[PDB]
Design a protein around this nucleic acid. Structure first.
Ligand SMILES: [Zn+2]
Lengths: 84, 104, 32, 204, 103
RNA sequence: ACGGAGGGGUACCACCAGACGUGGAGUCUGCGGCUCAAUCUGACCCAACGCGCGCACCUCACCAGGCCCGGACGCGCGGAGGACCGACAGCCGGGCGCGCUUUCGCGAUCGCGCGGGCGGUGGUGCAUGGCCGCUCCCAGCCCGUGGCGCGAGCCGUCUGC
RNA sequence: AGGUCUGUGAUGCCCUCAGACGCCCUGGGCCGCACGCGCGCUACACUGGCGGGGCCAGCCGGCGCCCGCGAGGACGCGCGGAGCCCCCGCCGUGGCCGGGACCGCGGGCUGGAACGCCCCCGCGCACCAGGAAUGUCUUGUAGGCGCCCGCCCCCACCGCG
């Protein structure tokens, strides 16, 4: 299909090549381009606790990215202290 | 699955030189920022996560290295059997020794 | 699920080792 | 008068390094248990971090001329993407092992997995602590055997003084029948020469 | 020579962060290092349910982490980069008490 | 332990004296019931029902349909005289070399079976650890020596202020 | 035998494992409605509604110019805080200028994609202080008034303050 296409009059409607605004969160995977054609073509953020691979109930405040449940266990070492 | 030989050799060399692979738990599309390879590409091209993950699994299952997982990062370490096997695939001689033995 | 045939020495498009060649429409190795 | 997004880098730079550490604690606990690791730290150097550790058996952690320690040294570098060589771990030693909860709990866990039952191990541990100058210990073992506790002397369990004097630890044991939850708590009222409140003296 | 350099101290614990400045000012006894500005405390706050399953009376943990910081921009170019290293060595080694120098 | 038994005390999660309210309407939300292919599930007096930290796709288990092996490691048989893997063009397909119809390409990264895995928001919270809730917005709980009882137990640990 | 195996490289035993409960892609659903109630929000007006004006907070905090009625939009740089309330007028006991549910054209924002959210013109539902019953509260307290954070591509009648 590399030697085919649509009408020119329709091509004017092509989506603006301006890069998409829906990226994927990387806490720290090199951004690089059969089943490969659509293994995970759908693009969406996948923010998740950097401890447990769980995408539910994650704090993004201050750039933590820690599950609320897994927060209590490590809070003591992380520095947070329970007073007042 | 059809993993290139250049990737095999690159990973082996990186392992022996560093004695340590610090890998991330991933299974989607994406290349590794560390190890690298060149196949008439003009610029060293990095490997894909699926390839290296399968290679690491095979190696560890064969008893060449051991691992810890911590959280979100497979840490690997090659055993004596490791040094005794990579040197063969890199086609090395017993005299050579991993870098870390040389005052890190 | 396409099938395959046992390979034969047909690439010899000549009559005495004359290397004639290095099929419906045209096509090149790979897609280009 | 001042801009609030400049100091945000310094504030956010200090917080990242805090988490950078806890992962170290977890990893050491999963790896250098053999040497009974206790705790770690950090000291952001010019081009690296001067992490020092505390393990009761210093010899086990390091290898021939610290060879395995060197091995570990490179590993961390790639994980944090720091330059090797600049990494400079340090190794320390703990003197009063009968005053730390974690080494005792790890030894006790290993002993339990040596087929020996709870009673002997718990009494060995409490004897080891008391003979090491401790006001008291408390061993709790919970699992498929309920809760069978053992205790010797006086402990406090409420108030601000608890977090500084009392030191607790916990573990999990994967046994064929299930899981054996085990924890330990030690109350040393002479830590670092700190005066416990409502502790008075009068002279002649 | 002269660089209009700056000194910044960042940390969490009030005890060390207050003791360390005393040593610094000792070391700057003769180089003119003076009082530090003490910024308002950056009291970070987080709240969370105490129950992993959300049963019973709704209760809430309240953890907070403060970020004390002090600044000794006094040196500026008053000192040379030669002893700016000397400034950074005679000072005590505290395990966690991050610092950074900029002009 | 209980008592529509007595005596001492105590508390705006009890009352006296007051205040402000809800239940009456419209509406946000959750909970049962009905409906659908599905309307995913946990909890039901205090001690379930803006609570399991904001559901167009993911979140997501549920319904209609479709790609891939991403089957480690050992043993037996086969394999470069060719193991496995991709593709321009035309049709059917929501689309994909998904399938078919011709014919090119790639080369051991293996293929079949037997052992043996990894994985899984699948089940039992009446198999368990950990963490919370409640008893508890309480004032109570026990040790060594000694004494009393065959003994379970009692005194210590108070019918005073 | 309160809740949690559906928070986790926490886990025993069961069930699934090449037409998959694995991982991924396109759609739909979790919002669907004769009805019962639980925490809340808006009101039933003159101790008030509308217009113009003056003005002071704290957890803390980002602004200029130009188009557009408004929501919003193109540029360029580091700079900065409210409702109640007080003053002057209109309305004049009429379900009326109280009330803003519901509905019809239209203009914009996020996003690959509106079923999501804002602004403008028009229509203007019940509601005349709420039965049996029931909840909370003693000083900067109840009550009234507004302002920031959380999850968040957009949105707060919610929760923490
Ligand atoms: Zn977590």
């Amino acid at each position: 299909r590399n030697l085919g296409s649509c009408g020119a009059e329709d091509l004017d409607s092509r989506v603006h090549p301006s890069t998409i605004f829906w990226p994927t969160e990387a806490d720290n995977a090199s951004g690089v381009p059969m089943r490969e054609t659509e293994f995970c073509t759908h693009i969406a953020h996948k923010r998740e606790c950097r401890i447990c691979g769980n995408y539910n109930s994650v704090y993004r405040k201050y750039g933590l990215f820690i599950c609320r449940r897994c927060f209590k266990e490590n809070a003591g070492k992380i520095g947070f202290v329970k007073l007042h | 699955v059809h993993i290139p030989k250049a990737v095999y050799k690159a990973v082996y060399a990186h392992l022996y030189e560093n004695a340590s692979l610090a890998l991330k738990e991933y299974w989607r599309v994406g290349n590794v920022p560390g190890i690298t390879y060149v196949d008439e590409n003009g610029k060293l091209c990095n490997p894909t996560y699926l390839h290296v993950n399968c290679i690491m699994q095979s190696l560890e299952s064969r008893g060449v290295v051991k691992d810890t997982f911590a959280w979100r990062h497979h840490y690997y370490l090659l055993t004596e059997k490791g040094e005794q096997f990579i040197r063969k695939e890199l086609d090395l001689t017993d005299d050579v020794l991993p870098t870390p033995y040389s005052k890190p | 699920e396409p099938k395959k045939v046992r390979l034969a020495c047909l690439k010899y498009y000549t009559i005495k080792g004359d290397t004639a060649e290095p099929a419906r429409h045209a096509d090149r190795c790979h897609c280009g | 008068i001042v801009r609030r997004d400049e100091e945000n880098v310094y504030y956010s730079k200090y917080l990242n390094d805090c988490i950078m550490e806890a992962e170290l604690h977890e990893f050491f606990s999963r790896e250098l248990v053999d040497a009974g690791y206790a705790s770690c730290s950090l000291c952001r150097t010019i081009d690296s971090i001067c992490v020092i550790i505390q393990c009761a058996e210093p010899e086990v952690v390091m290898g021939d001329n610290h060879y395995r320690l060197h091995k570990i040294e490179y590993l961390l570098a790639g994980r944090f993407m720091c330059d090797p060589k600049n990494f400079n771990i340090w190794v320390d030693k703990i003197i009063k092992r009968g005053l730390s909860a974690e080494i005792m709990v790890d030894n006790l866990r290993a002993k339990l997995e040596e087929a020996m039952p709870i009673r002997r191990a718990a009494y060995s541990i409490i004897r080891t602590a008391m003979r090491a100058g401790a006001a008291g210990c408390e061993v709790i073992v919970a699992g498929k055997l309920r809760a069978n506790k053992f205790k010797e002397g006086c402990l406090i369990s409420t108030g601000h003084p608890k977090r500084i004097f009392l030191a607790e630890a916990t573990r999990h044991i994967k046994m064929r029948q299930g899981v054996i939850g085990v924890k330990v708590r030690i109350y040393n009222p002479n830590i670092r020469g700190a005066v416990m409140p409502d502790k008075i003296e009068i002279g002649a | 020579m002269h660089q209009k350099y700056t000194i910044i101290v960042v940390g969490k614990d009030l005890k060390l962060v207050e003791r360390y400045v005393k040593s610094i000012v000792k070391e700057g006894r003769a180089f003119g290092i003076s009082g530090p500005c003490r910024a308002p405390v950056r009291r970070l706050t987080i709240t969370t349910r105490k129950s992993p399953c959300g049963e019973g009376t709704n209760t809430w943990h309240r953890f907070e982490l403060r970020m004390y910081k002090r600044t000794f921009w006094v040196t500026c170019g008053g000192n040379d980069i030669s002893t700016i290293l000397s400034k950074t060595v005679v000072i005590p080694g505290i395990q966690v008490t991050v610092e950074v120098e900029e002009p």
